[PDB]
Design an enzyme around this catalytic site. Sequence first.
Site, short mmCIF file in Angstrom:
data_model
loop_
_atom_site.label_atom_id
_atom_site.label_comp_id
_atom_site.label_asym_id
_atom_site.label_seq_id
_atom_site.Cartn_x
_atom_site.Cartn_y
_atom_site.Cartn_z
N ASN A 104 10.82 -31.84 64.28
CA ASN A 104 12.04 -31.34 64.62
C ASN A 104 12.90 -32.44 64.27
O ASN A 104 12.68 -33.59 63.83
CB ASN A 104 12.39 -30.99 66.26
CG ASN A 104 11.95 -29.49 66.46
OD1 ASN A 104 12.19 -28.59 65.61
ND2 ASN A 104 11.72 -29.50 67.70
N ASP A 118 0.84 7.69 35.64
CA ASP A 118 -0.09 7.90 34.41
C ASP A 118 -0.29 9.46 34.39
O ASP A 118 -0.65 9.92 35.32
CB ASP A 118 -1.10 7.01 34.40
CG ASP A 118 -2.08 7.42 35.57
OD1 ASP A 118 -1.61 7.74 36.53
OD2 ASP A 118 -3.12 7.22 35.33
N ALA A 152 0.88 16.57 39.64
CA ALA A 152 0.26 16.43 40.72
C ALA A 152 0.05 14.70 40.78
O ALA A 152 -0.35 14.41 39.80
CB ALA A 152 -1.04 17.17 40.91
N1 LIG Z 1 12.75 -47.51 66.57
C1 LIG Z 1 12.03 -46.42 66.01
N2 LIG Z 1 12.69 -45.74 65.30
C2 LIG Z 1 12.04 -44.39 64.93
C3 LIG Z 1 10.61 -44.20 65.06
N3 LIG Z 1 10.08 -43.07 64.50
C4 LIG Z 1 11.31 -42.72 63.99
N4 LIG Z 1 12.23 -43.45 64.17
C5 LIG Z 1 13.55 -43.06 63.80
O1 LIG Z 1 13.72 -41.94 63.01
C6 LIG Z 1 14.73 -41.70 62.25
C7 LIG Z 1 13.87 -40.96 61.09
O2 LIG Z 1 14.21 -39.51 61.32
P1 LIG Z 1 13.63 -38.41 60.25
O3 LIG Z 1 11.97 -38.29 60.36
O4 LIG Z 1 14.06 -38.98 58.91
O5 LIG Z 1 14.14 -36.91 60.55
P2 LIG Z 1 13.76 -35.72 59.90
O6 LIG Z 1 13.77 -35.98 58.36
O7 LIG Z 1 14.95 -34.61 59.88
O8 LIG Z 1 12.58 -35.20 60.30
C8 LIG Z 1 15.02 -43.15 61.77
O9 LIG Z 1 16.27 -43.47 61.74
C9 LIG Z 1 14.26 -43.93 62.65
O10 LIG Z 1 15.26 -44.90 63.12
C10 LIG Z 1 9.98 -45.31 65.90
O11 LIG Z 1 8.74 -45.42 66.05
N5 LIG Z 1 10.68 -46.47 66.30
#
Ligand SMILES: Nc1nc2c(ncn2[C@@H]2O[C@H](COP(=O)(O)OP(=O)(O)O)[C@@H](O)[C@H]2O)c(=O)[nH]1
Lengths: 1589, 84
Positions: A588, A1194, A1216
């Site tokens: 998501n 056919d 047929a």
């Molecule tokens: N601080 C932090 N941010 C995270 C972490 N995992 C994901 N993010 C954030 O999630 C965002 C990326 O989302 P994304 O996977 O690209 O969304 P999707 O492509 O729609 O699935 C980035 O802006 C990150 O800042 C984490 O472990 N720590």
Amino acid sequence: DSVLHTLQMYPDDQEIQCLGLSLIGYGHLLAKILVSSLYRFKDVAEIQTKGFQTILAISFSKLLVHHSFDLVIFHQMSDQQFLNLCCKCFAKVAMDDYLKNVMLERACDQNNSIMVECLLLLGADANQSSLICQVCEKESSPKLVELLLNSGSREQDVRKALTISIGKGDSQIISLLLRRLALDVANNSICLGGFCIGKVEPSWLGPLFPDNIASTLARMVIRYQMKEYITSLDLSANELRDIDALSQKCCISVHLEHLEKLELHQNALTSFPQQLCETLKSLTHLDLHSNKFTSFPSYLLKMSCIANLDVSRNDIGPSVVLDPTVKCPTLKQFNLSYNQLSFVPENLTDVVEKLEQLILEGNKISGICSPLRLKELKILNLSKNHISSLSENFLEACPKVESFSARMNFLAAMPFLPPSMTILKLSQNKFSCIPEAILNLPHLRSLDMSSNDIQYLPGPAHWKSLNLRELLFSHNQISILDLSEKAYLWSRVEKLHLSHNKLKEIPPEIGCLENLTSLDVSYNLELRSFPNEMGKLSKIWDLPLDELHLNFDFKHIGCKAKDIIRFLQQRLKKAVPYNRMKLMIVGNTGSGKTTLLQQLMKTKKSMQSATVGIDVKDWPIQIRRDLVLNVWDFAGREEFYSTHPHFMTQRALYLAVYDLSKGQAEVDAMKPWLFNIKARASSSPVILVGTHLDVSDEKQRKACMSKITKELLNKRGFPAIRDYHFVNATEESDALAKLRKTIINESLNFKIRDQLVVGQLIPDCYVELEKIILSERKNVPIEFPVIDRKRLLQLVRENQLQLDENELPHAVHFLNESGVLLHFQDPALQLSDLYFVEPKWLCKIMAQILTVKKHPKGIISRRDNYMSQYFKLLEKFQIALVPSSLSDHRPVIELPHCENSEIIIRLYEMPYFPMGFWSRLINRLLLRPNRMYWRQGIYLNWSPEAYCLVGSEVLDNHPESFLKITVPSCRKGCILLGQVVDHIDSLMEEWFPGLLEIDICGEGETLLKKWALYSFNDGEEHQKILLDDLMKKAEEGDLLVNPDQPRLTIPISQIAPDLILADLPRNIMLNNDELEFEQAPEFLLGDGSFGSVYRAAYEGEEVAVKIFNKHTSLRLLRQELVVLCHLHHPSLISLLAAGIRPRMLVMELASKGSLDRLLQQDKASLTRTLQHRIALHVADGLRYLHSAMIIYRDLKPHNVLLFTLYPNAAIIAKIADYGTPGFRAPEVARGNVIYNQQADVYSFGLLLYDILTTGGRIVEGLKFPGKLPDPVKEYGCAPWPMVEKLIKQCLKENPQERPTSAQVFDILNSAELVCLTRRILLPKNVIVECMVATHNASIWLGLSFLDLNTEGYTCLALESWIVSGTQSGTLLVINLEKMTDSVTCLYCNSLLVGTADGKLAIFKILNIGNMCLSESVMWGGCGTKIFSFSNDFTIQKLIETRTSQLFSYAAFSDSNIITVVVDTALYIAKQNSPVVEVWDKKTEKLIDCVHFLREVYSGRVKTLCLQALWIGTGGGHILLLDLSTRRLIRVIYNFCNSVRVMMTAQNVMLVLGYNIQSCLTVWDINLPHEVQNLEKHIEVRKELAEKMR
Amino acid sequence: TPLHLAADSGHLEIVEVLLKTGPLHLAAHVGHLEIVEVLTPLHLAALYGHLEIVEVLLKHWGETPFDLAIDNGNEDIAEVLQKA
Ligand SMILES: Nc1nc2c(ncn2[C@@H]2O[C@H](COP(=O)(O)OP(=O)(O)O)[C@@H](O)[C@H]2O)c(=O)[nH]1
């Protein structure tokens, strides 16, 4: 009015009546007085001239006809001036068609012959109860009935008249009706089958066997208005309970000695009369089955010559002992199938000697077999018996047996088989091992041992036979296929069946059977390994692959048998393991899929700014295998949720990524994603991955995010989750390393169906293609990363790749499944020739309009070279209205009917809504209706009684999502509900198989409940009781559904019309009381050749019922039923009934069987006037099918049913296509393209080729790959121009050129086409003036020779000698005196020679004139002066044709006499005279040919001859006429371009024409009939084709 | 039209009256010099064999008229046609 009043008030006064009639000519009731006066004095006095004049002077005619003046006219007709006046009055009155029909009706009831014939000649068609029923109910004279039959009338009307006349006691009318209905003089047969005649007496059959004033009055009226004994007797379907009436000594018993064929089948006979059999001394084809016999006659073999005896459904007693006193040697075949026998005939050896085929299948012969001392036996049948053991001497005295067959018998061993043995049929037995005797056979070719249980199948070493043609061993218990000993000994085997066998592996010697054309190894469930030696078997065209989970990447269309052999051969060349997997990450928004991938990437060169599209990218793995896997960073936002299901594959490993910054709730947000993964990829594994630990405390991780995962997320509707982690996807750590290790370990150990799909072996060609594709990925332009087909073929040719155009479909499909490129093989898109490399750009540019932005929301129009194709993909991946952003809030809708009594409502409860379910649906449901769409519903409606509201509606305290379908209860509403139900069910089965997946472990929840709602209390009940669909379907034995209390009930059709067959335009159900059907081998049609089609009785008649199995699908039956509700045609089989208790299909029964069986069994019945009818009916059916856009698959001689063998019937052939080769068009078999009607035309041309040949190219039974041979060249068929030309026009390699089925029927519809034998082309620049016949038959052309059967090119006359006279004279004769002038005429009579200056020579030198013989005494003429003569050599007459200068011009009248034809009135032709002059033989006193040609072109007569007068004009046209009213029949526009001489010959008509080129055409004498007989044959069909509407 | 019938009949008075009131093939077939003078045709004249009519017309499948002259056997007409 004073005169009329005086006449009316003073009747019975002829003198006053005359004055009244005179003053009448110098008013509805006014004609009444005239009618009364005419009736009173119809024959009292001849004062009718004044009345006729007044009538001529006088809407009046209609009132006069209504005034019963027809009776007065008939009385007068029943005096040249009076006759002329009466004729003129009749012609004036009968101008209107309605008046003529009324007069015919009012004259037919009374018994007359002259007035009716005159009216028929004037017109008055007999199709208006109809006429014939009326004239047969009143017991009229035979002349009236015969005259009416000769005219145009309906066949069904004549049949009804036959029933009526049979009801009464009569012979003449009945015989005439039978002759009109059933008499084929051309074929020497009587086709009395289909009629339900109660009995047969010699009085009716007597006249059936072979043994003018009205015309003049009709001609006068028109002029006034203008100003070999028969053999076959078929008595099959008549309910002949007894036939002894034909065993007497009547006038036909002498004629009953030339039968040679007697057919009494489907009857109720008891015993053949002995007198009939002894008086039938020339009968060699007698059959009598489906009769209620009780014992063999034992005298039926006492006739002189007999063969092909057939008693195949009678109930013969246990003992059938033939009488030893009979020694008939003439018998050949002896059918005794399906009787009630229990011992074989006890005197088969002595009574008959030369018996060839002895068939006893289906009997109950229980005792052991007798020695069977038959010396000439060829084929023996003992199938479907109850036999225990064979005597050791069973086959010890039949040294010629070829096809001994014993199916479904309790046999244990085989006795001494004669060495000449060739075919064995021992299937369905109980054999532990193959007997020694079978192995010791030296000429075995077709041995079938299916349905047995043989543990040991010997290899080629222990088989003495070398000519093994076929081997059937299906449904056995065989574990070994020993072949290593001598793999070349079985090199002649073509068929080898091993289905339903316990096989483990195919040994590596199967490639030495190069002739093997069909090897069936299916349902073994343990093979999983096809050896690579199966590449040298390019002769296999079919190979069933079912319940074999082979590692080969199967394709929907790019997987044909020969393609599989080619792939196996390529793997044989060089094999390399494949290492590629798809790691597609789902989740998501905000869950960190992209960041997790990047940290997994070990990449630091990279805010992810969300993610549009799918974002594919490759990844290599450095364990020490390469294991390159492509990741698909799926989008998360809930708008790209409809394109995702297309990029979800079973052969891949998913992920599932959390967001623990929230915790306890995002774990509850994967139920959509995980349920979708289960639905699309049932067998794939999932690896849940937490993705926020650095911002989430130990609390949330220790929350049910780690416990509900092990409590509710682990099972109960979700796929096999393997492992879960809680990595921090922002930097490398121990958790990330463990995640990478477990990803690699799961990839190495996928094991799809225990096959290790991650390391399967493939031919090196595929890996080379992949390497080339990623090599080429860079050099393509950035804007269009796509290369076209031409560039691909250039690349494949440039390198060392050894794949031809046949390998490319499978290769590109496998490379598509791998994920480097995407290729669309569907031949409906405009994209089939374009190969999509770089899928990342495709997805990114596809998902462009979803992330970008008067009318309702979701409706857009075309707005911002390739764009015309760019939208085509969008509607194929459910992007375009746009189902995304489509007003999730349901718009206000008021149902027209909300009364709880006329709305059918269906519920479709499911745990969730799979991704893009509504997007695929509302793009699939689509008088143009009015509709408004939203995100989860359509509500499309046409009328207040025709609407459909399908949508999503939730229930309180119900977490699931419910799909509701509401339709009105009317027929249109029922059809709408049915259609929506099949659409939804098909979408669910095809796209989300995980929904319809009954899991064995746990319980049969089925994950998909289809509730059907019903309310007992009509209206205001407010509580519909739920009912599962399958539970109601289990209640298929009854129609009404009722609760535990039987007080109330409701029909199923009102609450579930998709279940009971009521969702169709026509109510199609059968009352089981009327049907009389029972499944049995006896009632099988064609011995299982048609599948599951049996013979039954419906509504008293006979029908063929197709019986379905117990799969309870009720989806193929409805699919077959919906098409049959729209097809109504005489040449298309028609629907009668369709049940649900046995789930059957009732169709008409064609009594003559299929066409294939007919031409393979009855070769003498396919006369030249029957093949044309069959082809015409089949062409009509194809034309109708293609008219309504339906396309046939056919056409074969097996797919065509024959309803009657009578050329003059309304229907002779029908098409047929039952459910469950060489007749293939060269457009789809060689290549790949959508099937079109041109392929149907090609198949029809093939069928024409087989019909034209007596047996066709199907007797051989060999491999049948525009190279077809000339049929006349080798098949022995008689020539047939415009039919061979039609075949050649139907067999061209360019489908666009081939004629449409609409025009092929037109070409096949021509009276010239049937009646035209030969069209011989002479050598160029050859001129022939006169020709003569010699009769094999030959032609002497002025003395060049021509052979009728060889076309052997190498005045005149014809005593095997010829006589010719040169243009300078000098008469010559070849096995004489030179006259002063050239010999212009010659004739053979007991010889006359003409002269240019005028002189006749008899061999007399009399000169008459200052040249054209004839006959019938004699006739002729010199110059313009015609004459006549006899053996007296005197001019008995002399008429100057120049005297007819008052009518024709002097140019035509004053010319010479070219030819004359005399039968009863002379017709003389003059040079360049387009008006043949008719001269009488007594009165010595105009057929304008140019007028006839203008009605249809030199028009100058050049030659003519009589039988219908044929006039050969100088323009090349044969005008056809008749000797009655001189009405034009046809204008034959032959390709001769001119005519020189036409003449009769032995019955044909030779024609010589100049085109320089000389053409010799051979028309048929029957041509004048076939112009009419066919023309009224089409209309009687056309009306039928319109009656069904 | 009565003119065609008059030309066919060869009636000089009737033809003249019809012409003065305000058919070549028929006249050629009849072979009347007066009718031809008062009023294809060459082929018809060659087939019939009217030298005067053919000469007057020359002064004034459907192949050339000379083609039928050989077949018709009119030697003089054939020579005349070949000359022109
Ligand atoms: N601080 C932090 N941010 C995270 C972490 N995992 C994901 N993010 C954030 O999630 C965002 C990326 O989302 P994304 O996977 O690209 O969304 P999707 O492509 O729609 O699935 C980035 O802006 C990150 O800042 C984490 O472990 N720590």
